[PDB]
Amino acid sequence: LGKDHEILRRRIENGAKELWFFLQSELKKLKNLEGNELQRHADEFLLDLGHHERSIMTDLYYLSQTDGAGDWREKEAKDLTELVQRRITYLQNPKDCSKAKKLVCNINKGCGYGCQLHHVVYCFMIAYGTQRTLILESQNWRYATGGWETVFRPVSETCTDRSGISTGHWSGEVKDKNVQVVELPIVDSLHPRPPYLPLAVPEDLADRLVRVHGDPAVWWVSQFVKYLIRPQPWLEKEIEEATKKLGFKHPVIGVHVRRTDKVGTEAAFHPIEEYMVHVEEHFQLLARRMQVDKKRVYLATDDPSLLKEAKTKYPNYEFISDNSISWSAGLHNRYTENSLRGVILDIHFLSQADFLVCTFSSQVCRVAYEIMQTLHPDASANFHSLDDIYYFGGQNAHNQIAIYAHQPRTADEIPMEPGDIIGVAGNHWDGYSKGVNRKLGRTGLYPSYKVREKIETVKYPTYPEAE
């Protein structure tokens, strides 16, 4: 056993104890306070708690690194990426294009870019599970009528032709076993649904993945995103240039303020302070472990009036942003090639950030979060969403398992017994989550710490000839 590992574990153990002493002590005093005097000490209480908590969280990070834990996790996460990408490449490049089995996907989903991109990932996962090579029809793309290869490398190097001796619409893996080319519709109307869907992970990879990653469902998704967004040489250049011109350097926290048409339809308005309290909170955390030259925030928004307001309210923050891209995100100009390349860059610099604050209700932020997973080993915790937790549009039921019994204090809370299956709908970022105890058919609130993630696996193809 490692000496540093033991010293850290004990320091974490003690930090929780001294925190518990501190909580009981100050709360006992708080019960005897009123009005103005109450609020001052309550605020001072929260101030001391923040540092105390971040001190514990810092040691928890150090524990995830000592005695080669960081080095090993980096190596193992590398092999998993290499392994999966190896299989996808093998699958995508058959020797004979005319005789390979193909699954056709059309990009023109009536929605934004992130929603459109996730439809392709959804297509890619099924083709992987069904041992079919992906053919992507991308003409008349609303962001770039030229097609997919306007910005990204083609999904295949040997088989982009869609021909085949038998073609039909999707009817199931078994029924379509003798159809060479299968046309896949969008997931919103898919019938029947196959097992090769989120949030399930490959049977053969689950054990290795959980050992490494804190949310293996996103990593499995991210591997298909990594492959898709292989840039054209000119796109790779534009990224490198924008990086230099914007002064993009670490440490930097990415922020995505989605507004315009999202407000009122799929999400709500969120003031700049709502995002920034978590940025400053995380910057305080980083300062506990490293020298912070400047507090950098890469702002990505479809509200161009925001950047000036952000600079004013936060003078000690260097905001890295391309305000002309924010204008390209406008509604009248959204579906053009220039706006497409703008959001691609915004997502890129968002994913490169050391931390990501946003609303996960927006498809835009979810992509940057997923791409972030391909850049670090187990980057699953490096975010804070203002509303929704992570999901994937069209996923199978996200389920948790109750580990501690809960008795409802109000009618808004549901009771839980250990073993009960809880269908989670989100986290309220206040200690409680909302869901339904499937056992009782009751929907309500419950303590977030009293449940546990139920990881699902699916018997995927392992593509051993890819080695």
Ligand X SMILES: CC(=O)N[C@@H]1[C@@H](O)[C@H](O[C@@H]2O[C@H](CO[C@H]3O[C@H](CO)[C@@H](O)[C@H](O)[C@@H]3O)[C@@H](O)[C@H](O[C@H]3O[C@H](CO)[C@@H](O)[C@H](O)[C@@H]3O[C@@H]3O[C@H](CO)[C@@H](O)[C@H](O)[C@H]3NC(C)=O)[C@@H]2O)[C@@H](CO)O[C@H]1O
Q: Residue 351, interface with ligand GDP (CB under 6 A)?
A: no
Q: Considering CB distances under 5 to 8 angstroms, the limit depending on partner class, which of ligand GDP, ligand X, a copy of itself, none binds residue 35?
A: a copy of itself
- Identify the burial level of 45 via C-beta atoms within 10 angstroms of its C-beta, where 0-12 means exposed, 13-18 middle and 19 or more buried: middle
Q: Considering CB distances under 5 to 8 angstroms, the limit depending on partner class, which of ligand X, ligand GDP, a copy of itself, none binds residue 398?
A: ligand X
Reading the block at residue 19, the tokens are: 């925190």
Q: How far is Cα 107 from Cα 96, in angstroms, rounded to an integer?
A: 25
305 with 332: CB under 8 angstroms? no
Pick from 348, 359, 349: nearest CA to 383? 359
Residue 183 CB, shortest distance to ligand X, in Å, is: 18
**Strand partners for 135:** 104
Q: Are strands 167-169 and 421-427 parallel, antiparallel or unpaired?
A: unpaired
Give whichever of 323 and 427 is closer to ligand X, judged by the CB atom. Answer: 427
Pick from 192, 80, 82: nearest CA to 126? 192
Q: How many residues bind ligand GDP (CB under 6 A)?
A: 22
Integer CA distances (angstroms), 329 to 160, 261, 332, 344, in order: 31, 11, 9, 11
Q: Considering CB distances under 5 to 8 angstroms, the limit depending on partner class, which of ligand X, a copy of itself, ligand GDP, none binds residue 467?
A: none
- Please list every residue from 437 through 466 that binds a copy of itself, using CB under 8 A: 447-450, 452
Pick from 455, 441, 262, 442: nearest CA to 358? 262
Q: Residue 51, interface with a copy of itself (CB under 8 A)?
A: yes
Chain centre to alpha carbon of residue 306: 24
Q: Among 210, 242, 425, 455, which residue sits at the site for ligand X (rule: CB under 6 A)? A: 425
Pick from 455, 454, 388: nearest CA to 422? 454
Give whichever of 366 and 384 is closer to a copy of itself, judged by the CB atom. Answer: 384
Q: Residue 364, interface with ligand GDP (CB under 6 A)?
A: yes
Amino acid found at 399: N
Pick from 264, 220, 261: nearest CA to 390? 220
Q: Residue 115, interface with ligand GDP (CB under 6 A)?
A: yes
Q: Considering CB distances under 5 to 8 angstroms, the limit depending on partner class, which of ligand X, ligand GDP, a copy of itself, none binds residue 187?
A: ligand X
Q: Are strands 355-358 and 252-257 parallel, antiparallel or unpaired?
A: parallel
Q: What is the per-residue binding string for ligand GDP in 286-305, x denoting contact by CB under 6 A?
A: --------------xxx---
Q: Considering CB distances under 5 to 8 angstroms, the limit depending on partner class, which of ligand GDP, a copy of itself, ligand X, none binds residue 300?
A: ligand GDP
Q: Among 6, 37, 79, 188, which residue sits at the site for ligand X (rule: CB under 6 A)? A: 188
Q: Considering CB distances under 5 to 8 angstroms, the limit depending on partner class, which of a copy of itself, ligand GDP, ligand X, none binds residue 24?
A: a copy of itself
Give whichever of 412 and 417 is closer to ligand X, judged by the CB atom. Answer: 412
Q: Considering CB distances under 5 to 8 angstroms, the limit depending on partner class, which of ligand GDP, a copy of itself, ligand X, none binds residue 19?
A: a copy of itself
- Identify the burial level of 344 via C-beta atoms within 10 angstroms of its C-beta, where 0-12 means exposed, 13-18 middle and 19 or more buried: buried
Reading the block at residue 462, the tokens are: 């392992």
271 with 357: CB under 8 angstroms? no
Q: Residue 370, interface with ligand GDP (CB under 6 A)?
A: no
Q: Considering CB distances under 5 to 8 angstroms, the limit depending on partner class, which of ligand GDP, ligand X, a copy of itself, none binds residue 301?
A: ligand GDP
Give whichever of 167 and 380 is closer to a copy of itself, judged by the CB atom. Answer: 380
> Contact residues for ligand X (CB under 6 A)?
111, 115, 118, 187-188, 266-267, 361, 387-388, 391, 393-395, 397-398, 425-428, 434
